[PDB]
Coordinates of C-alpha atoms and ligand atoms in Angstrom, one line a residue:
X18 CA 0.0 0.0 0.0
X19 CA 0.9 3.7 -0.2
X20 CA -0.5 7.0 1.2
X21 CA -1.3 10.6 0.4
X22 CA 0.8 13.4 1.9
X23 CA -2.3 15.4 3.0
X24 CA -5.7 15.0 4.6
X25 CA -8.9 14.2 2.7
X26 CA -11.2 17.1 1.6
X27 CA -14.9 16.9 2.5
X28 CA -16.8 15.9 -0.7
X29 CA -20.2 17.2 0.4
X30 CA -20.5 20.4 -1.6
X31 CA -18.6 19.0 -4.7
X32 CA -19.9 19.0 -8.3
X33 CA -18.6 16.3 -10.6
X34 CA -18.5 15.9 -14.4
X35 CA -17.6 13.0 -16.7
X36 CA -17.1 12.7 -20.5
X37 CA -19.4 9.6 -20.5
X38 CA -21.3 7.9 -17.7
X39 CA -23.5 4.9 -18.3
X40 CA -26.7 4.9 -16.3
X41 CA -26.1 3.0 -13.0
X42 CA -22.4 4.1 -13.0
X43 CA -23.0 7.9 -12.7
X44 CA -20.2 10.4 -12.4
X45 CA -21.1 10.9 -8.8
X46 CA -20.8 7.2 -7.9
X47 CA -17.1 8.1 -7.6
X48 CA -17.6 10.4 -4.6
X49 CA -20.5 8.7 -2.8
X50 CA -18.4 7.0 -0.1
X51 CA -19.5 3.6 -1.2
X52 CA -16.7 1.4 -2.6
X53 CA -19.2 -0.9 -4.4
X54 CA -20.5 1.8 -6.6
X55 CA -18.3 3.2 -9.4
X56 CA -18.4 5.7 -12.3
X57 CA -18.1 3.9 -15.6
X58 CA -17.9 5.3 -19.1
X59 CA -20.4 4.4 -21.9
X60 CA -20.3 0.8 -23.0
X61 CA -22.4 -1.8 -24.9
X62 CA -25.6 0.0 -26.0
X63 CA -24.2 3.5 -25.6
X64 CA -21.2 2.3 -27.6
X65 CA -17.7 1.8 -26.2
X66 CA -16.1 5.2 -26.5
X67 CA -12.4 4.5 -26.2
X68 CA -10.1 6.5 -23.8
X69 CA -9.1 9.3 -22.9
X70 CA -11.8 9.7 -20.3
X71 CA -12.1 12.7 -18.0
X72 CA -13.2 13.1 -14.4
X73 CA -13.5 16.8 -13.3
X74 CA -14.3 18.1 -9.8
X75 CA -15.6 21.5 -8.7
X76 CA -14.8 21.6 -5.0
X77 CA -16.9 24.8 -4.9
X78 CA -14.3 26.5 -2.7
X79 CA -10.5 27.0 -2.8
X80 CA -8.4 24.3 -1.1
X81 CA -4.6 23.8 -0.7
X82 CA -4.5 20.6 -2.8
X83 CA -1.5 18.3 -2.5
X84 CA -2.8 14.9 -3.7
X85 CA -5.6 12.6 -4.8
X86 CA -6.5 9.0 -4.5
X87 CA -8.3 6.7 -6.9
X88 CA -9.9 3.4 -5.9
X89 CA -10.6 0.9 -8.7
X90 CA -13.7 -1.3 -8.8
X91 CA -13.7 -3.9 -6.1
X92 CA -16.2 -6.3 -7.6
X93 CA -13.6 -8.7 -9.1
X94 CA -13.6 -7.3 -12.7
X95 CA -10.7 -5.5 -14.3
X96 CA -12.6 -3.3 -16.7
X97 CA -11.9 0.4 -16.1
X98 CA -8.5 0.2 -14.4
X99 CA -6.6 3.3 -15.2
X100 CA -3.1 3.0 -16.8
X101 CA -1.6 6.2 -18.2
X102 CA -3.1 9.4 -16.7
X103 CA -2.7 13.1 -15.9
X104 CA -3.9 15.3 -13.0
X105 CA -4.8 19.0 -13.6
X106 CA -5.5 21.8 -11.2
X107 CA -7.6 24.9 -12.1
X108 CA -8.7 28.1 -10.6
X109 CA -11.3 28.9 -13.3
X110 CA -12.5 25.8 -15.0
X111 CA -11.1 26.7 -18.4
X112 CA -7.3 27.2 -18.0
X113 CA -5.8 23.9 -16.8
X114 CA -2.2 24.6 -17.5
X115 CA 0.5 21.9 -17.2
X116 CA -0.3 18.6 -15.4
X117 CA 0.8 18.6 -11.7
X118 CA 1.1 14.8 -11.9
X119 CA 1.3 12.2 -14.7
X120 CA 2.5 8.6 -15.3
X121 CA 1.2 5.1 -15.2
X122 CA -0.6 3.2 -12.4
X123 CA 0.1 -0.5 -11.9
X124 CA -2.5 -3.0 -13.2
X125 CA -4.4 -4.1 -10.0
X126 CA -7.3 -3.2 -7.7
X127 CA -5.2 -1.4 -5.0
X128 CA -5.8 2.3 -4.3
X129 CA -3.6 4.5 -6.5
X130 CA -2.2 7.9 -5.5
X131 CA -1.0 11.1 -7.1
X132 CA 1.1 13.1 -4.6
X133 CA 2.4 16.5 -5.6
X134 CA 3.6 19.9 -4.3
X135 CA 0.8 21.9 -2.7
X136 CA -1.0 24.3 -5.0
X137 CA -4.2 26.2 -4.1
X138 CA -7.0 25.1 -6.5
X139 CA -10.8 24.8 -6.8
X140 CA -11.1 22.2 -9.5
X141 CA -9.3 18.8 -10.0
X142 CA -9.2 16.8 -13.2
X143 CA -8.1 13.2 -13.5
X144 CA -7.7 12.1 -17.2
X145 CA -7.4 8.4 -17.9
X146 CA -5.3 8.3 -21.1
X147 CA -5.4 4.5 -21.1
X148 CA -6.8 1.4 -19.5
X149 CA -4.4 -1.1 -17.8
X150 CA -5.3 -3.8 -20.4
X151 CA -6.2 -1.8 -23.5
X152 CA -9.9 -1.9 -23.1
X153 CA -12.2 1.2 -23.9
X154 CA -13.3 1.8 -20.3
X155 CA -12.6 3.9 -17.2
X156 CA -14.3 2.9 -13.9
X157 CA -13.5 4.8 -10.6
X158 CA -15.0 3.4 -7.4
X159 CA -13.9 6.2 -5.2
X160 CA -11.9 9.4 -5.8
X161 CA -10.5 11.7 -3.2
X162 CA -8.5 15.0 -3.2
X163 CA -6.1 16.0 -0.4
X164 CA -5.0 19.2 1.2
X165 CA -1.9 20.3 3.1
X166 CA -2.2 22.2 6.4
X167 CA -1.1 25.5 4.7
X168 CA 0.4 26.9 1.6
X169 CA 3.8 28.6 1.3
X170 CA 4.8 29.8 -2.1
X171 CA 8.3 28.7 -3.1
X172 CA 11.0 31.4 -2.5
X173 CA 12.5 33.1 -5.7
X174 CA 15.9 31.8 -6.8
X175 CA 15.7 28.5 -4.8
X176 CA 14.6 26.1 -7.5
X177 CA 11.2 24.4 -8.0
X178 CA 9.7 21.0 -7.3
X179 CA 7.3 19.4 -9.8
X180 CA 5.8 17.8 -11.7
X181 CA 5.2 14.3 -10.2
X182 CA 5.8 11.3 -12.3
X183 CA 3.4 8.5 -11.3
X184 CA 5.1 5.0 -11.5
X185 CA 3.8 1.4 -11.5
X186 CA 6.6 0.4 -9.2
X187 CA 8.8 1.8 -6.4
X188 CA 12.0 2.9 -8.2
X189 CA 14.6 1.6 -5.7
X190 CA 17.2 1.3 -8.5
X191 CA 17.6 3.5 -11.6
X192 CA 19.9 4.6 -14.3
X193 CA 19.8 6.9 -17.4
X194 CA 19.8 5.1 -20.7
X195 CA 22.5 7.3 -22.4
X196 CA 21.6 6.6 -26.0
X197 CA 17.9 7.4 -25.5
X198 CA 17.8 9.8 -22.6
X199 CA 15.3 7.5 -20.8
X200 CA 15.2 6.8 -17.1
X201 CA 15.4 3.1 -16.4
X202 CA 14.0 2.0 -13.1
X203 CA 13.6 -1.4 -11.4
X204 CA 12.2 -2.8 -8.2
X205 CA 12.3 -6.6 -7.7
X206 CA 10.2 -9.6 -8.5
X207 CA 7.1 -7.7 -7.4
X208 CA 6.3 -4.0 -8.0
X209 CA 6.3 -3.1 -4.3
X210 CA 8.1 -6.0 -2.7
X211 CA 11.4 -7.9 -2.6
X212 CA 10.7 -10.2 0.4
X213 CA 9.8 -13.7 -0.6
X214 CA 11.2 -13.7 -4.2
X215 CA 11.6 -16.9 -6.2
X216 CA 14.4 -15.3 -8.1
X217 CA 14.9 -14.9 -11.9
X218 CA 12.6 -12.0 -12.5
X219 CA 12.7 -8.2 -12.3
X220 CA 10.0 -5.6 -12.9
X221 CA 11.5 -2.6 -14.7
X222 CA 10.0 0.7 -15.6
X223 CA 11.0 3.5 -18.0
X224 CA 10.2 7.2 -18.3
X225 CA 10.8 9.2 -21.4
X226 CA 11.4 12.9 -20.4
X227 CA 10.5 13.9 -24.0
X228 CA 7.3 12.1 -24.3
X229 CA 6.3 11.8 -20.7
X230 CA 5.4 8.1 -21.1
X231 CA 5.9 5.5 -18.3
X232 CA 6.3 2.0 -19.7
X233 CA 7.1 -1.1 -17.6
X234 CA 8.7 -4.4 -18.9
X235 CA 9.3 -7.6 -17.1
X236 CA 12.8 -9.0 -17.4
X237 CA 13.5 -12.8 -17.0
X238 CA 15.9 -13.4 -19.8
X239 CA 18.9 -12.8 -17.5
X240 CA 17.2 -15.0 -14.8
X241 CA 18.0 -12.2 -12.3
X242 CA 16.2 -10.5 -9.5
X243 CA 18.2 -7.3 -9.7
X244 CA 17.1 -6.0 -6.2
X245 CA 20.0 -4.8 -4.0
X246 CA 22.6 -5.0 -6.8
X247 CA 25.9 -3.4 -7.7
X248 CA 25.7 -1.0 -10.6
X249 CA 28.5 0.2 -13.0
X250 CA 28.5 1.4 -16.6
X251 CA 31.5 -0.4 -18.2
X252 CA 34.0 0.9 -20.8
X253 CA 31.7 -0.4 -23.5
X254 CA 28.7 1.7 -22.5
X255 CA 26.8 -1.3 -21.1
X256 CA 25.3 -1.1 -17.6
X257 CA 26.6 -3.9 -15.4
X258 CA 24.1 -5.0 -12.7
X259 CA 25.4 -7.5 -10.1
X260 CA 23.9 -9.8 -7.5
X261 CA 21.3 -8.8 -5.1
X262 CA 18.3 -11.2 -4.7
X263 CA 20.0 -13.5 -7.1
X264 CA 23.5 -13.1 -5.5
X265 CA 25.6 -14.6 -8.2
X266 CA 24.0 -13.2 -11.4
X267 CA 25.3 -10.5 -13.7
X268 CA 22.8 -8.7 -16.0
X269 CA 24.0 -6.3 -18.7
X270 CA 21.8 -3.5 -20.1
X271 CA 22.6 -2.3 -23.7
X272 CA 21.2 1.2 -24.2
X273 CA 21.8 1.0 -28.0
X274 CA 19.5 -2.0 -28.6
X275 CA 17.5 -1.4 -25.4
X276 CA 17.9 -5.0 -24.2
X277 CA 19.1 -7.1 -21.3
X278 CA 21.9 -9.6 -22.0
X279 CA 23.0 -12.4 -19.6
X280 CA 26.4 -11.8 -18.1
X281 CA 28.9 -14.3 -16.5
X282 CA 28.3 -15.2 -12.9
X283 CA 30.5 -13.4 -10.3
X284 CA 33.1 -15.4 -8.4
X285 CA 31.6 -14.5 -5.1
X286 CA 27.9 -14.1 -4.4
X287 CA 27.1 -10.6 -3.2
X288 CA 24.3 -8.1 -2.3
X289 CA 24.5 -4.4 -1.5
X290 CA 28.0 -4.2 -2.7
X291 CA 29.5 -1.3 -4.6
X292 CA 31.0 -1.7 -8.1
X293 CA 33.2 0.9 -9.7
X294 CA 34.4 1.2 -13.3
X295 CA 38.2 1.3 -13.8
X296 CA 40.4 3.4 -16.1
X297 CA 40.5 0.5 -18.6
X298 CA 36.8 -0.1 -18.8
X299 CA 36.6 -3.1 -16.5
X300 CA 34.5 -3.3 -13.4
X301 CA 35.7 -3.7 -9.8
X302 CA 33.6 -4.8 -6.9
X303 CA 34.1 -5.7 -3.2
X304 CA 32.0 -6.4 -0.1
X305 CA 28.3 -7.1 -0.2
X306 CA 27.1 -9.3 2.6
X307 CA 23.3 -8.6 2.3
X308 CA 23.0 -11.7 0.1
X309 CA 25.0 -14.8 -1.0
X310 CA 26.3 -15.3 2.5
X311 CA 27.9 -13.3 5.3
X312 CA 31.7 -13.7 5.2
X313 CA 34.8 -11.9 3.9
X314 CA 34.1 -11.1 0.3
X315 CA 37.2 -9.7 -1.4
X316 CA 37.5 -7.8 -4.6
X317 CA 37.0 -9.2 -8.1
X318 CA 37.1 -7.7 -11.6
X319 CA 34.8 -8.1 -14.6
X320 CA 36.2 -7.8 -18.2
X321 CA 33.7 -6.6 -20.8
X322 CA 35.9 -8.0 -23.6
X323 CA 36.5 -11.6 -22.4
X324 CA 33.1 -11.6 -20.5
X325 CA 34.7 -13.0 -17.3
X326 CA 34.9 -12.2 -13.6
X327 CA 38.3 -12.7 -12.1
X328 CA 38.8 -13.0 -8.3
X329 CA 41.3 -10.6 -6.7
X330 CA 41.7 -12.3 -3.2
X331 CA 44.5 -9.9 -2.1
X332 CA 42.3 -6.9 -2.6
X333 CA 41.2 -7.4 1.0
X334 CA 37.8 -6.1 2.1
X335 CA 38.8 -6.1 5.7
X336 CA 40.5 -2.6 6.0
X337 CA 37.3 -0.9 4.6
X338 CA 34.9 -2.5 7.1
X339 CA 33.0 -0.1 9.4
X340 CA 32.2 -0.9 13.0
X341 CA 28.5 -1.6 12.4
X342 CA 26.6 -3.1 15.4
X343 CA 25.0 -5.6 13.0
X344 CA 28.5 -6.8 12.1
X345 CA 29.7 -8.0 8.7
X346 CA 26.1 -8.1 7.3
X347 CA 26.2 -4.3 7.0
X348 CA 29.8 -3.3 7.5
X349 CA 31.0 -4.2 3.9
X350 CA 28.0 -2.5 2.3
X351 CA 27.8 0.5 -0.1
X352 CA 31.5 1.4 -0.3
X353 CA 32.2 4.9 -1.7
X354 CA 34.1 3.7 -4.7
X355 CA 35.8 5.8 -7.4
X356 CA 37.7 4.5 -10.5
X357 CA 41.0 6.3 -10.6
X358 CA 44.4 6.2 -12.3
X359 CA 46.2 3.0 -13.4
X360 CA 43.4 0.6 -12.7
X361 CA 43.2 1.8 -9.1
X362 CA 39.9 2.3 -7.2
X363 CA 39.7 4.8 -4.3
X364 CA 37.5 3.8 -1.3
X365 CA 36.6 7.1 0.4
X366 CA 34.2 5.5 2.9
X367 CA 31.8 5.0 4.6
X368 CA 34.4 3.6 6.9
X369 CA 36.6 6.1 8.8
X370 CA 39.7 4.4 7.2
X371 CA 40.1 5.2 3.5
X372 CA 42.0 2.9 1.1
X373 CA 43.6 2.4 -2.3
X374 CA 42.6 -0.8 -4.2
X375 CA 44.9 -2.1 -6.9
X376 CA 43.6 -4.5 -9.7
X377 CA 46.9 -5.7 -11.0
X378 CA 47.8 -9.4 -10.3
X379 CA 45.7 -10.8 -7.6
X380 CA 44.9 -7.4 -6.2
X381 CA 46.1 -5.4 -3.3
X382 CA 44.9 -2.8 -0.8
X383 CA 46.9 0.1 0.6
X384 CA 45.8 2.4 3.5
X385 CA 45.1 6.0 2.4
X386 CA 44.7 7.5 5.9
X387 CA 41.6 8.5 7.8
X388 CA 38.7 10.8 6.6
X389 CA 39.4 13.7 9.0
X390 CA 39.8 17.5 9.4
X391 CA 40.8 20.0 12.1
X392 CA 37.5 19.1 13.8
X393 CA 38.9 15.6 14.4
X394 CA 38.5 12.1 12.9
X395 CA 35.2 11.4 11.0
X396 CA 33.1 8.5 12.3
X397 CA 31.8 5.7 10.1
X398 CA 29.2 7.3 7.7
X399 CA 27.1 4.4 6.5
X400 CA 24.7 5.5 3.8
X401 CA 26.4 8.9 3.5
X402 CA 27.0 10.2 0.0
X403 CA 30.2 10.7 -2.0
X404 CA 30.4 12.8 -5.2
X405 CA 33.4 13.5 -7.5
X406 CA 32.6 17.1 -8.6
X407 CA 36.0 17.9 -10.2
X408 CA 37.8 14.7 -11.3
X409 CA 40.4 16.9 -13.0
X410 CA 41.5 18.1 -9.5
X411 CA 40.5 14.8 -7.9
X412 CA 37.8 16.5 -5.8
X413 CA 35.3 14.4 -3.9
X414 CA 32.6 15.8 -1.6
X415 CA 31.4 13.5 1.2
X416 CA 28.4 14.1 3.5
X417 CA 25.7 12.7 5.8
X418 CA 25.3 9.1 7.0
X419 CA 25.4 7.5 10.3
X420 CA 27.6 5.1 12.5
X421 CA 25.2 2.2 11.9
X422 CA 23.0 1.1 9.0
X423 CA 19.9 1.7 11.2
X424 CA 18.7 2.9 14.6
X425 CA 21.6 5.4 14.4
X426 CA 21.7 9.2 14.3
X427 CA 22.7 10.9 11.1
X428 CA 25.5 13.4 11.0
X429 CA 25.9 16.8 9.3
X430 CA 29.6 15.9 8.6
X431 CA 30.9 16.9 5.3
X432 CA 34.4 16.6 3.8
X433 CA 36.4 17.5 0.7
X434 CA 38.9 14.8 -0.3
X435 CA 41.5 15.7 -2.8
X436 CA 43.0 12.7 -4.7
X437 CA 46.6 12.6 -6.1
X438 CA 48.5 9.6 -7.3
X439 CA 47.3 6.1 -6.2
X440 CA 49.1 5.1 -3.0
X441 CA 49.5 8.6 -1.6
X442 CA 47.4 9.6 1.4
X443 CA 44.9 12.2 -0.1
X444 CA 44.3 15.5 1.6
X445 CA 41.0 16.0 3.5
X446 CA 39.3 19.1 5.0
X447 CA 35.9 19.9 6.4
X448 CA 33.3 21.1 3.9
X449 CA 32.2 24.6 5.0
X450 CA 30.4 24.0 8.3
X451 CA 28.7 20.8 7.3
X452 CA 25.1 20.1 6.1
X453 CA 22.2 22.2 7.3
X454 CA 20.3 19.0 8.1
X455 CA 21.8 15.8 9.4
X456 CA 20.6 13.1 7.0
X457 CA 21.0 9.5 6.0
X458 CA 19.4 7.5 3.1
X459 CA 19.6 10.8 1.2
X460 CA 20.8 11.1 -2.4
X461 CA 22.8 13.5 -4.5
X462 CA 24.0 14.4 -8.0
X463 CA 26.7 16.7 -9.4
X464 CA 25.1 19.5 -11.4
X465 CA 26.6 21.1 -14.6
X466 CA 28.2 24.0 -12.7
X467 CA 30.0 21.7 -10.3
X468 CA 27.6 22.3 -7.5
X469 CA 26.2 19.2 -5.7
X470 CA 22.5 18.8 -5.2
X471 CA 21.7 16.9 -1.9
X472 CA 18.1 15.8 -1.2
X473 CA 15.8 13.6 0.9
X474 CA 16.9 11.4 3.9
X475 CA 15.9 11.4 7.6
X476 CA 17.7 12.4 10.8
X477 CA 17.6 8.9 12.1
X478 CA 17.9 5.7 10.0
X479 CA 14.9 3.5 10.2
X480 CA 14.3 1.6 7.0
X481 CA 10.7 1.6 5.7
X482 CA 9.7 4.3 8.2
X483 CA 8.9 7.9 7.1
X484 CA 10.1 9.5 10.3
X485 CA 12.3 12.5 11.0
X486 CA 12.2 13.4 7.2
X487 CA 14.2 16.3 5.7
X488 CA 12.2 18.1 3.1
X489 CA 14.8 20.8 2.4
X490 CA 17.4 19.9 -0.1
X491 CA 20.8 21.6 -0.1
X492 CA 23.3 22.6 -2.8
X493 CA 27.1 22.9 -2.2
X494 CA 28.9 25.5 -4.2
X495 CA 32.7 24.6 -4.3
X496 CA 33.9 28.1 -5.4
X497 CA 32.4 29.6 -2.2
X498 CA 32.6 26.5 0.1
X499 CA 29.0 27.2 1.1
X500 CA 25.9 25.2 1.3
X501 CA 22.5 26.7 0.3
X502 CA 19.1 25.5 1.2
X503 CA 16.7 25.1 -1.7
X504 CA 12.9 25.1 -1.9
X505 CA 11.3 22.2 0.1
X506 CA 9.3 19.3 -1.4
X507 CA 6.4 17.4 0.1
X508 CA 7.2 13.7 -0.4
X509 CA 9.4 11.8 2.0
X510 CA 12.4 10.3 0.3
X511 CA 14.2 7.9 2.6
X512 CA 15.3 4.3 2.4
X513 CA 15.2 3.0 -1.2
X514 CA 15.1 6.5 -2.8
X515 CA 17.1 7.6 -5.8
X516 CA 18.3 10.6 -7.7
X517 CA 19.7 11.1 -11.1
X518 CA 20.8 14.0 -13.3
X519 CA 18.7 14.3 -16.4
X520 CA 20.2 15.2 -19.8
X521 CA 18.2 18.4 -19.6
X522 CA 20.0 19.5 -16.4
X523 CA 17.1 18.8 -14.1
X524 CA 17.1 16.3 -11.2
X525 CA 15.0 13.1 -11.1
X526 CA 14.4 12.1 -7.5
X527 CA 12.0 9.3 -6.5
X528 CA 11.3 6.0 -4.8
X529 CA 11.6 5.0 -1.2
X530 CA 9.8 2.1 0.5
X531 CA 9.5 -1.3 -1.2
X532 CA 8.1 -3.1 1.9
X533 CA 4.9 -4.7 0.6
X534 CA 1.9 -4.1 2.8
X535 CA 3.6 -1.1 4.4
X536 CA 2.0 2.3 3.8
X537 CA 5.4 3.8 3.1
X538 CA 5.8 2.7 -0.5
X539 CA 6.3 5.7 -2.9
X540 CA 5.4 4.8 -6.5
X541 CA 6.6 8.1 -7.9
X542 CA 9.3 10.6 -8.5
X543 CA 9.4 14.4 -8.8
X544 CA 11.5 16.7 -11.0
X545 CA 13.7 19.4 -9.4
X546 CA 14.5 22.4 -11.6
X547 CA 17.6 24.2 -10.3
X548 CA 17.6 28.0 -10.2
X549 CA 20.0 28.0 -13.1
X550 CA 17.2 27.3 -15.6
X551 CA 15.4 30.5 -14.5
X552 CA 16.0 34.2 -15.1
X553 CA 15.5 37.1 -12.7
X554 CA 11.8 37.2 -13.4
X555 CA 11.1 33.7 -12.2
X556 CA 10.6 32.5 -15.8
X557 CA 12.4 29.8 -17.7
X558 CA 15.6 31.2 -19.2
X559 CA 16.6 31.0 -22.8
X560 CA 19.2 28.2 -23.0
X561 CA 22.3 28.2 -25.2
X562 CA 22.1 25.7 -28.0
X563 CA 24.9 23.4 -29.2
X564 CA 24.5 23.6 -32.9
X565 CA 27.4 21.4 -33.9
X566 CA 29.9 18.8 -32.6
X567 CA 32.9 17.7 -34.6
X568 CA 32.3 14.1 -33.3
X569 CA 30.4 12.4 -30.5
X570 CA 32.9 9.6 -29.9
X571 CA 36.3 10.6 -28.6
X572 CA 39.4 8.8 -27.3
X573 CA 41.0 10.2 -24.0
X574 CA 43.3 13.0 -24.9
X575 CA 41.3 13.7 -28.1
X576 CA 39.8 17.0 -29.0
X577 CA 36.2 18.1 -29.8
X578 CA 35.1 21.2 -31.6
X579 CA 31.6 22.6 -31.1
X580 CA 29.4 25.5 -32.4
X581 CA 26.9 27.3 -30.3
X582 CA 24.2 29.9 -30.9
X583 CA 25.6 32.3 -28.4
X584 CA 28.9 32.9 -26.6
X585 CA 29.5 30.4 -23.8
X586 CA 31.6 31.1 -20.7
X587 CA 31.9 27.6 -19.2
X588 CA 31.6 23.9 -20.3
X589 CA 31.6 20.6 -18.5
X590 CA 31.4 16.8 -19.1
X591 CA 29.3 14.8 -16.7
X592 CA 29.4 11.1 -16.7
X593 CA 26.0 9.3 -16.9
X594 CA 24.9 7.9 -13.6
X595 CA 23.2 4.9 -12.0
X596 CA 21.7 4.8 -8.5
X597 CA 20.5 2.6 -5.7
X598 CA 20.9 2.5 -1.9
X599 CA 22.7 6.0 -1.9
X600 CA 25.4 4.6 -4.2
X601 CA 26.3 6.2 -7.5
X602 CA 29.9 5.3 -8.7
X603 CA 29.3 6.3 -12.3
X604 CA 28.6 10.1 -12.1
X605 CA 31.5 12.4 -12.1
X606 CA 32.3 15.9 -13.5
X607 CA 35.0 17.2 -15.7
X608 CA 35.5 21.0 -15.9
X609 CA 36.5 21.9 -19.5
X610 CA 39.1 24.5 -20.4
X611 CA 37.8 26.1 -23.6
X612 CA 39.7 27.4 -26.5
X613 CA 37.8 30.2 -28.2
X614 CA 38.0 29.7 -32.0
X615 CA 35.9 32.8 -32.4
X616 CA 32.5 33.2 -34.0
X617 CA 30.9 31.1 -31.2
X618 CA 33.1 28.2 -32.1
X619 CA 35.0 26.3 -29.4
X620 CA 37.3 23.4 -28.8
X621 CA 38.5 21.4 -25.7
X622 CA 40.5 18.3 -24.9
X623 CA 39.2 15.3 -23.0
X624 CA 41.7 14.5 -20.2
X625 CA 44.3 12.1 -21.5
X626 CA 44.2 10.1 -18.2
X627 CA 41.3 7.6 -18.6
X628 CA 41.4 7.3 -14.8
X629 CA 40.0 10.8 -14.6
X630 CA 38.0 10.6 -17.8
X631 CA 36.6 7.1 -17.2
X632 CA 35.4 5.4 -20.4
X633 CA 31.7 5.3 -21.1
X634 CA 29.0 7.8 -21.9
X635 CA 29.2 11.4 -20.9
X636 CA 27.0 14.6 -21.1
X637 CA 28.3 17.8 -22.6
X638 CA 26.9 21.0 -21.1
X639 CA 27.7 24.6 -22.1
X640 CA 26.8 27.6 -20.0
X641 CA 26.4 31.2 -21.0
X642 CA 27.6 34.2 -19.0
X643 CA 24.3 34.1 -17.1
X644 CA 25.0 30.6 -15.9
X645 CA 22.1 29.0 -17.8
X646 CA 23.1 25.5 -19.2
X647 CA 22.2 24.0 -22.6
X648 CA 20.7 20.5 -22.7
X649 CA 23.3 17.8 -22.9
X650 CA 25.0 16.4 -26.0
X651 CA 26.0 12.8 -25.5
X652 CA 29.7 12.1 -26.0
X653 CA 31.1 8.6 -25.8
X654 CA 34.6 8.4 -24.3
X655 CA 36.9 5.5 -25.1
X656 CA 40.4 4.8 -24.0
Ligands
CU1_13 CU1 17.5 -2.4 0.2
NA14 NA1 -18.6 4.7 -5.1

């Protein structure tokens, strides 16, 4: 089950309208309080007018709406279940504007919801674009609208939340499909649950930012339940999903052909591990005691070319273990991994001890010192985040987390780690004065301007519980070493939530839950539009356009020449990301030093060190003097 973010509005005075309503299934059957009566569009003798079908409500008075619920027919029949849909809010009953929520509701008889930022309105319109099985009907047993306690208009210059993307599953794991710009999401064997899985099946869901369509597909060809996996985009552009519910499986996702291909089994069964792409395109992983057993699981490396997993026993997991009260089950989880120079992988945390992992021979591990600062040694930060915002200067920003996986207080701790050559103890300092809000289970993404967007989480880690939630996201600005609070959202994003940077420079944040009958399952996501896509007036700014690219596939050290429609001041490459359980080892940013060829023509060189410029798919972004970024041009980097 799920839940609305506000309280139900009294449906007494209400006035309802429908496009079609067969006698006996009146428009008002939907707001009568009886779950055995339902509105139903024309059918049979009145014909079967196919969808879309519209349900409009005049609440008579103005209410601070923040959500709605739709209850399907409970008589045992499937006819009328809504699939694709949109939710509009109006003040006048003519001008509906943009949809506050849209997506696709799962095919079943459970109550569906649409939760979105509070917006005062008098009318509510639920459009049923499609029917869960392709039939011509729309039948709503009970429909409700919700209101928040009060309305506070967003503050100017602090970004905006919305719209809401309704999903058929709980996106506990996601990635951007680089060749198509689609958001791939997956839950487990069930749409809202992982517990009690027979293995070999994964429900996936996609969202196309261009078209706004939510489409789900069931994957069984890789015989893999991809819940709690390791995720890495290899040197060949394929996404490498490892272990989880099916602890030894490896599933590969090819963006080009939009298909899943079976991969070789890992040497050691794992779950909740972290995998990181190396400078040569291979994939390194270590830890992961959530599944496949609880014992010392050392590093191993996957080769895209030979399609093999090779064990690296001497790349010891031991030195990176936290002091979790639940022991090894949690202590080797979600390592903060970063692919670096000469096949090395840097482990920044969550453990206090940081280390260097080597992939030559049978592997090796070398101590890199402790995450610290003048404020002292930093404690184990399980489920804290790590983001490489300037790979060129080996800059990593770390923050949040707690001593233990759960029943542990979050910290406001934040550090700036500065990598050098593999083997040398990197420099670390405190980041400003830490986070505004202590949080764990939160998520982050590096933005085009190098700033890091931090959102969601709770003050105290309690999986599946929406307590002590932080609704105010923060953004760190490296040039000022300052954190800035942004406009708050209304949906709790804790355990099992994700965040990804979209090709358009906006943030996709969603999920949380995945606990079956719990009321904390969030089958949605929202879009955050940073202040950089707005001008002084609060309007959407004109974005520079990348009119030409000399090539879209470049070797490390190679050069690219572009043409824009206006003069650009800054440019940056951002590696496509994947996300789950606060881990994202794929995203990273590269600040570009531009050469002005004149006439709005520019050139730049991709870093020759593939350890900085990891192979795979990247996003090219250009910014004008105003700071407004263009949409991204996809560049494939190869070694
Ligand atoms: Cu999990
Ligand atoms: Na009813």
